[PDB]
User: What shape does this take?
Amino acid sequence: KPHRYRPGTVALREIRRYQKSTELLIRKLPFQRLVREIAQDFKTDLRFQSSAVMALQEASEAYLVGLFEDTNLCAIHAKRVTIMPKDIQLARRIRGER
Amino acid sequence: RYRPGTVALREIRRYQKSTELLIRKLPFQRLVREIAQDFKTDLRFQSSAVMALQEASEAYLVGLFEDTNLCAIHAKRVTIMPKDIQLARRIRGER
Amino acid sequence: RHRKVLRDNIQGITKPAIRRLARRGGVKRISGLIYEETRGVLKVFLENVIRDAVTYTEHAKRKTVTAMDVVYALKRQGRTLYGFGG
Amino acid sequence: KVLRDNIQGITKPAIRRLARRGGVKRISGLIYEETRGVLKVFLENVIRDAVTYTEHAKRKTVTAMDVVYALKRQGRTLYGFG
Amino acid sequence: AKAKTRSSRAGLQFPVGRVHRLLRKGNYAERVGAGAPVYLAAVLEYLTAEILELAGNAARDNKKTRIIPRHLQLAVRNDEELNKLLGRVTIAQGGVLPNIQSVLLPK
Amino acid sequence: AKAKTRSSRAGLQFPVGRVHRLLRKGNYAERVGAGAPVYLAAVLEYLTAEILELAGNAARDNKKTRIIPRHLQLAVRNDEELNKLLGRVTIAQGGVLPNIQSVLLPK
Amino acid sequence: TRKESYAIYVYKVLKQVHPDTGISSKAMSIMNSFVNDVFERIAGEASRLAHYNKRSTITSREIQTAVRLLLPGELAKHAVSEGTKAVTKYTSA
Amino acid sequence: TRKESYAIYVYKVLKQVHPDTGISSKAMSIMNSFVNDVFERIAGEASRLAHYNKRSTITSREIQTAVRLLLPGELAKHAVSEGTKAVTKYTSA
Amino acid sequence: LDKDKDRDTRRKRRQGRS
DNA sequence: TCAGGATGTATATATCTGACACGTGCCTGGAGACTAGGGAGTAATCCCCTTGGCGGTTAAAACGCGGGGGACAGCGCGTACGTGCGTTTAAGCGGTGCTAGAGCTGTCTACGACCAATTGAGCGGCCTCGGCACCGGGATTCTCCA
DNA sequence: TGGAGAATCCCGGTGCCGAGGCCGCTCAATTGGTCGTAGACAGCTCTAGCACCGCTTAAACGCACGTACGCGCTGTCCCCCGCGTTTTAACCGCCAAGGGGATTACTCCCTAGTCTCCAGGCACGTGTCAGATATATACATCCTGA
Assistant: This one.
């Protein structure tokens, strides 16, 4: 029999690993293409410094991490371990974004 | 007699229909003076200052109870509990 | 000359008042443990506002807390209040 | 020079890596589309304020300080870029 | 020789000279341009007209002829953009919007 | 006469003259008193010393002798008052405090 | 000592919009506080914009950028239209 | 061009606190942003305090009240003690 | 009081190294 | 589903008030005119940093496949919260008195803006070595099947 | 409860590029004056905050009861996780073009400052009518019976 872990062990090891590290988790080039595509809808033919895209990526990843923490608190509050979109909607509703 | 929840809904409609303050003036004033005693003794208060504190406190508590009701509905209850208040204040960033 | 010290006025925020505040917020059913938690939350909020109001008063070298001090404290906590001046 | 459908560049493993950093143990399948939506909303707000700050300065280059000022104006002060 | 107010030159009701004096005496910059008080007074007059129109409609819908703070609260919280602008503002004697959740009502 | 810096008179490391220049050029008031940059430089030096001390302790706890942004994040978020001061601040390359919820740990 | 307010100007705007409608005293004070609050927001944003570009005067461009930064959507568009119309009518005479 | 910063002063304070510890450039920029942010916060609060009392001078009293408004608890008490000690040491000489 | 007495010793070593 | 009893709600009208609308003197602040100095607009240049393209590597993304574990619905039971009633308690209203303190006014001086001369502290540029990244390898440690 | 096996901590050698130190060169901080005005201080006024009393009645409190909702338990099934294999595009290095950010010089017009003039708006009285409260009342809503 091959070695297979139970569901939840690899999740906990990924949690410890990505909470131990400090690098960015989204790939640079798709985020850069997304930033340019979004900024195309405001003024055409814009240029970006590289540090501007790095600042946008740092702020976006920090915002998403805090949002997932509030989501996990909502999901634990509803006696679950699986986050669902209504948890995100409740978190953004309490925060004052929607 | 009415079934439980009818007078509750009637009170919800009535107190959302009106605008007056819901806390009595003199106990809130005594509470404000008791709290302000711990920073500087023999303080005086204008009446408009106590009224502004009452308006701000009632608005804060009403918004907190709305968020509490949302977290209580999220757990498929109709009864708010202290864990709901703790969750709302934690997500808001106060705790 | 009577230096009256107040104590236990947080019980003056009665259970019917908390019920009315919850009814305005749309709450249908209220637990029995809600009232002490609500008194604690109100005490924390009033302490945070009154400390800044007293700081604004002490800076002005006055003995009375004016309404503008409360308005400035609520502004400084990001809870701007209309209808009392400024 | 028109870009299109780059929101799928934020893939499912990247979203779940962000969720692992946030402490999440189990993730539903609709979380990815919901996360892409909220990310596009947030980036639209910040990029709109940054492009406004750039257009006021009569520049065609969005610098890092414009992003820092936009995040400062939205109450999300970011340290380490000037 | 014959004077004419700057509000009348721009067709505004709000005082241009008072906004100019407040901008000078508010320590915002070293110098203040000539067009900035006109522009700011126009923006303030537009926002005042926008909220007063909705407040008058809300007062008319309740068969009242004086605007009370409840009507201002209804006018702000019922329009999405004014609610977005005043999301962190408490209006005194304003009350709340009548809104009950659907899961609390019986069926 | 030979010159002594104003920072040397107050026994500070932070520049009082630069703080006075920034206070004058910041359009904060019409006048700036003489004691105000001394007070402000003292406050800035104290806060810098607090954060640098906690960051140096966190760097020693990882067997490193050079402070990286991760150590600054560990210094701020583990202290109650500093986290209360910087609750809205995002630190670049800072990471997250390691904390896993109790209901996710296996039984 | 006289204290100034925007009372008569708010009353004139109300008479322009709803000719047969009055306003109570507390609602008038709320409108006065609203005008002061929006004025401080736009003036502070224009001050920060002028300081960011190392300039020493607040012109109408700073006010227009502050209006576009503070007001959401249609309010921003119509307020920019109103301000440009008023500045044009002012400098055209 | 010359761009001023707070690097050498942060380095002097670091050598005063941890005599054998270095600091990366990214951490130096973060500490520089922190010093600038706290400076703007305290100066803006002192400007509000000067405007509220209809004064035209920012003195050490306004800075002390702004520190007591902005810093929580023991940080506020220690910062007030440090500022007062520095001001008396400055005015003694 | 446990954390409060710690921060005073933080200040005094600064005054002790100087 | 239909309907009667019952209770609470909005609706029809009086009347009485005190709060809003409006008119008056005046005085302070807004407007008109003129002068000067510098801040910003404009032009020209330069070179840095952005954009675009291409090739190779390989790590990460994508897709499919079991399979267990968690979400969810249903049910039963009991506690605790809503509802009503009668007793109790203090909030509210009005009226009086008093003095602490807020606010205005007039003098007067110490303190900060302004400016010119002077110079060393701070900043840009350029070595340089050591702290940290990286990797190969072995011991410890946790997880899964008995 | 004990072994097999994957992951991770710890040791140790090696390279490399970024932190630290030094050195030359500004230009911003310092020092020394004059000046005028903001602010401290005294003294008077007079408003509003505090304290007290009596009456009334509305709201708070306590208690009893019943039911509806919270919560624990069980069963089901489906869906998310773990793993292997294959595709694919991110990443890194390198090269080439050029757009635009940044700087410097020049100049002029825009705005601060001062003085004079006048009228717009603000405190103060005074009327009068919108709505608050009260009374009478048909109608919507809810509960029990069928």
The radius of gyration of chain F is 19 Å. The CA atoms of residues 12 and 42 of chain F lie 7 Å apart. Chain F has one domain: 1-107.
